[PDB]
């Protein structure tokens, strides 16, 4: 790491996402997050509990004395806990991101784009359903209900009957939150040997065993151009920390990471160690 925190100079909001702009050695840069995190601002204010952060951002009061300094200091801990610089966001910059309905509506649009591109749906066979969904979002109907209803009505013909609607909902939600690629393919639940059984929580080790996750070796993967593909329910059974580490180990070795809504499994076509105890 060069710096363990960076000051957010500006923000822009578009398509249910926010871009946080900062200077990195004289180079104007940004990181992207979903707007979801920026309605309840307090999950982002550094609390007393070590906890962890949903994303690598800390919000602070710009008028307050010692709230920036406390953030900068707290973020030399958080930067090590999550292996990312922490962006320090003056809460003044994120006062007008849209209404909680305006947010719901914009995220919903991203869910639709991902759903048609993923299952190859003509955007025109959706628009009656989309119009209905958006109208209910403005009546404060749960985003999570609107999406589930939309999928139940749009899936027929396009989504294999052996895929549960609730696994599609959850691919879509997670795909927009962390910008993860979504496929319908069979899962392999492979993860890189980089993440070690030894330091896993019992939840983590138990959960990997439960979905028959298997360790793969970096050069074996890079050689066979092997996508790591996780069933979304099995992926979300892991700890948030572990989920990030699996994905960052993949992106460093330039291996595509995909969530799937399928519970069918890839052929074991490669040297894989399956997870177990010692
Ligand atoms: Cl329904
Ligand atoms: Cl993320």
Swiss-Prot record:
Chain spans, region Y3: 98-179
Region of interest (Y4), ranges: 180-278
Stated regulation of activity: Inhibited in vitro by GRL-0617.
Reactions catalysed: Thiol-dependent hydrolysis of ester, thioester, amide, peptide and isopeptide bonds formed by the C-terminal Gly of ubiquitin (a 76-residue protein attached to proteins as an intracellular targeting signal)
Side of membrane Cytoplasmic, spans: 2-278
Recorded topology in the membrane: Multi-pass membrane protein
Domain annotation CoV Nsp3 Y: ranges: 2-278
Location of the region described as CoV-Y in the Swiss-Prot/TrEMBL record: 3-278
Compartment(s): Host endoplasmic reticulum membrane
Chain intervals for the UniProt region annotation (Y2): 3-97
Entry function: Responsible for the cleavages located at the N-terminus of the replicase polyprotein. Participates together with nsp4 in the assembly of virally-induced cytoplasmic double-membrane vesicles necessary for viral replication. Antagonizes innate immune induction of type I interferon by blocking the phosphorylation, dimerization and subsequent nuclear translocation of host IRF3. Also prevents host NF-kappa-B signaling. In addition, PL-PRO possesses a deubiquitinating/deISGylating activity and processes both 'Lys-48'- and 'Lys-63'-linked polyubiquitin chains from cellular substrates.
Subunit structure comment from the entry: May form homohexamers. Interacts with N protein.
Protein name from the UniProt record: Papain-like protease nsp3
Organism in which the protein naturally occurs: Severe acute respiratory syndrome coronavirus 2 (2019-nCoV)
Residues of the full protein shown: 2485 to 2761 of 4405
